Ligand binder design. Sequence first.
Ligand SMILES: *C(=O)/C=C\NC[C@H](O)CC=O
Ligand SMILES: [Cl-]
Length: 270
Amino acid sequence: NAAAQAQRQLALLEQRHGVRLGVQVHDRDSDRAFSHRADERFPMCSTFKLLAAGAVLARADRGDDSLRRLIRYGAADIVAYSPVTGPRQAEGMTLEQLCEAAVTRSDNTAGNLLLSTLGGPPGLTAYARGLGDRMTRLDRIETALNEARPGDPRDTTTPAAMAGNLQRLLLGDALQSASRQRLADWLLASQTGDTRLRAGLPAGWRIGDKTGAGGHGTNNDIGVIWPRDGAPVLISAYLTQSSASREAQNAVLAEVGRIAAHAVAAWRLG
Ligand SMILES: *C(=O)/C=C\NC[C@H](O)CC=O
Ligand SMILES: [Cl-]
């Protein structure tokens, strides 16, 4: 069967490359799933920005904050990999702009400003617990959280826990309609990840994804696949302990995408 075939291929892929690979796939159409190390801990890196944006959107839904509120921040607050917030330091950015920069561009300062709005990393963890995720924990801000030391439980999630969060946020009732659509838009618009899961999917399919990258050869890609025919598919892919280049790591994630696409295609064909 297709799920067993996919799990077999993931075992071979992981061994060929000497990595630790964590994958959860859940197809809403057939209700089938497959996984590899899906309950093990993996460093989140930038994938936390999906939850941070969800938490801020949920506050806006309640009137606990406003997406139009302008946030001002200082030159000393700008951390590495901040392509949107860096150039806009003198002018400030609204909460909506920061959500968009964090998700679509993986802007690290934007992620940190969202965290500050939530009260810090503990606010992110508390939000995750409210979604029914008992595993994810954020302990540090960017870029300290990208250390990704093996054996360190700080700043980790599990592939299965993050797939559960994707379902709640994009397909369930965690957010109101307009907020759910905005988050989906930002994920679809991200051109980070063009050589990761996207590279293994058929060209007629679509993917809204949030990437991450960190120390110890950590490279992640999570999101929702919209196949040519049928219902959305949740995918959560975490790779770490790679001794190879980023290009080679991206190719491993592209092969995860091919494996997932073939299983979904078989589920669509019966
Ligand atoms: C998401 O993971 C955003 C950026 N990733 C790369 C790191 O910031 C590089 C330094 O830690
Ligand atoms: Cl939602």
